Design a protein around this nucleic acid. Structure first.
Ligand SMILES: *O[C@H]1[C@@H](O)[C@H](n2cnc3c(N)ncnc32)O[C@@H]1COP(=O)(O)OP(=O)(O)OC[C@@H](O)[C@@H](O)[C@@H](O)Cn1c2nc(=O)[nH]c(=O)c-2nc2cc(C)c(C)cc21
Ligand SMILES: Nc1nc2c(ncn2[C@@H]2O[C@H](COP(=O)(O)OP(=O)(O)O)[C@@H](O)[C@H]2O)c(=O)[nH]1
Ligand SMILES: [Mn+2]
Ligand SMILES: [Mn+2]
Length: 544
RNA sequence: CGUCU
């Protein structure tokens, strides 16, 4: 049947010179040694990611799909949505957003400049009326930093990103932005993944897993999920959008966006030639993150009934997904997950790595993270969220003229602040750099470094300063990830942080706070860390 | 490029 893409042969060009590493990486050449292993996915490789994602999709839905889709449309019934004033939509355009062909950019859209407000008024007028003629879209390579894995091919090709003009993107928010805010939370309930915070996700899977008389979990993600999206899939997506209370102007524009934009259309490279025709999800539209999640919930929930997964609890975050269900004996469980994958490929959502049932919560990985255990200050099992530190580390060493990595360090130091690798490797190197730079209180990312103990206690609680025995898996992984990248062994970071703690305490003030809290683990003789006044005297909602 | 915390 349908082919996800049909190419013209025109290279996917780069929309701006690509960064090259320098002969000295001054910030990270103490963090790790093997810089030759850290790469970035240029548009050269885009040529070859194209091959990976072009193929012949063919679905075979069945009574299990159609039973789910029906009650999901019944969830959609209880949702009331509203249009978005052309102004309000312009106000939600991101500040660095890519400018429009027709001479105006994000700065002009957000300040309601006259020229932009008229062009968008006419785009939205072409959206109403003309419901058939496609909307031209642009196709970009996406540059990303990784570590080479010789096992799995050496260097990943660049993911492909496809987006309409800026005029169109404001119109999408008009038609669909309010939908996105309500629909998934309504159709999927507690199974909606983006809803939870890192601590909340953990509390969930822990509850889901103890609620079983004999738990069994697995994760499933589909391969090339943007490409496995058939046209019927998108139109059945609209079928759910339209099931809510919409002003009639919404339905017209929605229906026209689904035809002219979402179901496919031409594609042009940054140079401007014709590049191909797309017949799948264009990753890079408003619905992308929500369509993905909803479609995935349907196909998943369908396949759960086909295979007979019993009492399953779910957690969908886009096309990543995890099911904690009731074990049916080992050898039925293996048979069911094959039925599961079987349905999921008859739904045009084949897997990547084939799923496998696991009976220990640490071995399930969804959204590039897993759950592990450590011991808390009192001796209690503390469950946190961790990951394979390979890619965060490779990114800590990405250092060109344009890009500086200190953001990458903080972004992970916060997100994964309880993990052994952050506590010992990232935090040690972070303060070790800023004390020497003497830039120990800039405003990196709208954040101040000297607040980290307060921020961390706000988000992960005081135990992130006092967690000590680490799970065997997590040790072997951290140890081996450092080894893979040239970084010192954990032993060396223990000594390095012992000293970074010294300079921090001795600097006094808010610095000495960081030294005693973030590096309690380093000292021979701990200090009993009490809560901080800023466990509420810190606004809990600047990003969370 | 889009969504999100
Ligand atoms: O490696 C990432 C990541 O750790 C952090 N980052 C980016 N986006 C987010 C979100 N949504 N939540 C949490 N943390 C985030 O910063 C790194 C990305 O920046 P990068 O260095 O890759 O790009 P540039 O060098 O072009 O720009 C420097 C940025 O650091 C800067 O723009 C800053 O504003 C990043 N930043 C956000 N940026 C953004 O556009 N939107 C957001 O909502 C952002 N939120 C945050 C939140 C925090 C806590 C930080 C530290 C930075 C953020
Ligand atoms: N626009 C955009 N979409 C993304 C990005 N990453 C993931 N997605 C979407 O979410 C889906 C999840 O895919 P992923 O698990 O990252 O890898 P894949 O399934 O092999 O393509 C993708 O097909 C995209 O549609 C991104 O950086 N930008
Ligand atoms: Mn995937
Ligand atoms: Mn995924």
């Amino acid at each position: 049947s349908s082919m996800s893409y049909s190419w013209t042969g025109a290279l996917i060009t780069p929309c701006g010179p690509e960064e090259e590493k320098l002969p000295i990486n001054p910030l990270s050449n103490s963090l790790l040694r093997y810089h030759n292993k850290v790469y970035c996915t240029t548009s050269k490789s885009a040529s070859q990611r194209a091959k990976k994602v072009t193929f012949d999709r063919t679905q075979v839905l069945d009574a299990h799909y159609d039973s789910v889709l029906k009650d999901i449309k019944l969830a959609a019934s209880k949702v009331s949505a509203r249009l978005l004033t052309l102004q309000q939509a312009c106000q939600l355009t991101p500040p660095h957003s890519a400018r429009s062909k027709y001479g105006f950019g994000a700065k002009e859209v957000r300040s309601l400049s006259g020229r932009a407000v008229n062009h968008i008024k006419s785009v939205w007028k072409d959206l109403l009326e003309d419901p058939q003629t496609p909307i031209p879209t642009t196709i970009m390579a996406k540059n990303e930093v990784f570590c080479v894995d010789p096992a799995k091919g050496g260097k990943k090709p660049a993911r492909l990103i496809v987006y309409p003009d800026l005029g169109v993107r404001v119109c999408e928010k008009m038609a669909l932005y309010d939908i996105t805010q309500k629909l998934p939370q309504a159709v999927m309930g507690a199974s909606y993944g983006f809803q939870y915070s890192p601590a909340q996700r953990v509390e969930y899977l822990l509850k889901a897993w103890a609620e079983k008389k004999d738990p069994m979990g697995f994760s499933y993600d589909t391969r090339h999920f943007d490409s496995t999206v058939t046209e019927r899939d998108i139109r059945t997506e609209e079928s759910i959008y339209q099931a809510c209370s919409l002003p009639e102007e919404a339905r017209t524009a929605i229906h026209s966006l689904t035809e002219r934009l979402y179901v496919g259309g031409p594609m042009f490279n940054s140079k401007g030639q014709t590049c191909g025709y797309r017949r799948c999800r264009a990753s890079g539209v408003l619905t992308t993150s929500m369509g993905n999640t909803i479609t995935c919930y349907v196909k998943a929930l369908a396949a759960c009934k086909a295979a007979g997964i019993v009492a399953p609890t779910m957690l969908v975050c886009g096309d990543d997904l995890i099911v904690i269900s009731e074990s049916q004996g080992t050898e039925e469980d293996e048979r069911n997950l094959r039925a599961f994958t079987e349905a999921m490929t008859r739904y045009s959502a084949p897997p990547g790595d084939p799923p496998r049932p696991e009976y220990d919560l640490e071995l399930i990985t969804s959204c590039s993270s897993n759950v592990s255990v450590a011991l808390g200050p009192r001796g209690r099992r503390r469950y946190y969220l961790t990951r394979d530190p390979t890619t965060p580390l490779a990114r800590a060493a990405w250092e060109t003229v344009r890009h500086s990595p200190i953001n990458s360090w903080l972004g992970n130091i916060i997100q994964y602040a309880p993990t052994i690798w952050v506590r010992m490797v990232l935090m040690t190197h972070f303060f070790s750099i800023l004390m020497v730079q003497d830039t120990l209180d800039q405003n990196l990312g709208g954040v101040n470094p000297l607040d980290l103990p307060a921020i961390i206690e706000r988000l992960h609680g005081l135990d992130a300063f006092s967690m000590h025995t680490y799970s065997h898996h997590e040790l072997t992984r951290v140890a081996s990830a450092l080894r893979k990248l040239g970084a010192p062994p954990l032993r060396v970071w223990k000594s390095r942080a012992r000293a970074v703690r010294a300079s921090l305490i001795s600097r006094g003030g808010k610095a000495a706070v960081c030294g005693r809290y973030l590096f309690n683990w380093a000292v021979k003789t701990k200090l009993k860390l009490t809560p901080l006044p800023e466990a509420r005297l810190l606004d809990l909602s600047s990003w969370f």
